Amino acid sequence: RTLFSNLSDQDGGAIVAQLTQMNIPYRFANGSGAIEVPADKVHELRLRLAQQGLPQFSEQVNYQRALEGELARTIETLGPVKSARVHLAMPKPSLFVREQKSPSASVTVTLEPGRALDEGQISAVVHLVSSAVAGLPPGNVTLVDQSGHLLTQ
Amino acid sequence: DLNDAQLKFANDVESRIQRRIEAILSP
Amino acid sequence: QSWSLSVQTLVFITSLTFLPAILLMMTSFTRIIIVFGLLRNALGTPSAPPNQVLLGLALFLTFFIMSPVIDKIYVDAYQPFSEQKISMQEALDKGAQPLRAFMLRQTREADLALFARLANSGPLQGPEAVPMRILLPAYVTSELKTAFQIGFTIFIPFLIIDLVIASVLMALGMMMVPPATIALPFKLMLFVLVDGWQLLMGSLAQSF
């Protein structure tokens, strides 16, 4: 299954280097800028790579919803995470001409009783989400737990 | 410039007060 | 509390005796006069401009350099003292401040450290703790060193001209000629084509 698509050559190369180091089989889709990898490893690998910093309405909505769902699924592969919800809020093509807008994301996680996300895991989530959405800076990702505690500084 | 920094400071304070209220009002 | 008027007159007329000493040791007169003497020595002729002209010109340059300090003293000390708003001693203490700042700005750290070592000074602290009797000799020493630093590099172009002329003359063969005799007009030419006087005044003023 596709690990990543639409990668820069630089990111692609970095991702391939990491996969080789981890001894994970991979197949870079020919001229598809995509890297199909073991289906059962896709989510774990996305997270791991994120930790190392790598890399119509209905459709949009659907797309957005699909993206949200995928991101949630990936985040749920983290050990301490029981469930995750991702909400993406990219304003519709800035109607206002002068004012400038920017995409943001809100991530809510339900943690396993007695478990917490560490700083690394938190950073991985933030990176994963930011990288998935064009123009979404890490700073515009808010990560909260079930109790509403802000995890991202 | 500085006004935007002050406004962001106010927004963060308001958001944290909101979250503190929500935390106890949730259970 | 204030001094009597007779005491004020006595102190005021006695203090005028230290005017040459103040001008020499405490102001910019020393550096300018040393640089001017070194420049005459460097011109190849020892007494071309009479000492009187150089002394008057150095006095004018010192006045122009110190005019901001004089204005600060007048605002802080002279004007409120003459209007009978502060006493004489407090006026002197207030007026010593801008001159202290001027002396400090041109004072070498090593000079101040040495003269504080010789005066048994222990925990000095703020640059605003140095007494006048310690600050003054350090300022004089720093001024002498700075004047020498300026003079020995003022000497350089004239030595270059002397060496070039002597080398050309002797390599050509005429080794019996005195190189300085032929070199002096060229030193004057270099000084007048560079605008040596104007540029030298500019450099001396900018040195502060």
């Binding site: - | - | 300026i150 590099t153 172009p157 050309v168 390599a171 050509l172 063969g173 030298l200 450099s203 040195s207």
Partner: protein
């Protein structure tokens, strides 16, 4: 100052002097060598032959290169005087 804040300045000054005096000394040496070799080839016994070629060569070199050396020296002295206030510290 520092030995370096002085050695560098002296090196720059003597560079300037070397650039100023290089053309005259070079043409003088070349002319003297040429006249001496010509004299030895003909086995002429004389010591004062080279002086007049030397003097005309130096005179012509001065005429040709005077503006260049004078401008170089003037510029060097001007920058030295402008930088003088910062030399003390």
């Amino acid at each position: 100052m520092t030995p370096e804040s002085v050695m560098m300045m002296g090196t720059e000054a003597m560079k300037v002097a070397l650039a100023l005096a290089a053309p005259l000394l070079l043409v003088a040496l070349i002319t003297g060598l040429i006249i001496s070799i010509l004299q030895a080839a003909t086995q002429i016994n004389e010591m004062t032959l080279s002086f007049i070629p030397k003097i005309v060569a130096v005179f012509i070199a001065i005429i040709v290169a005077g503006p260049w050396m004078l401008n170089l020296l003037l510029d060097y002295v001007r920058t030295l005087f402008s930088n003088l206030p910062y030399i003390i510290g």
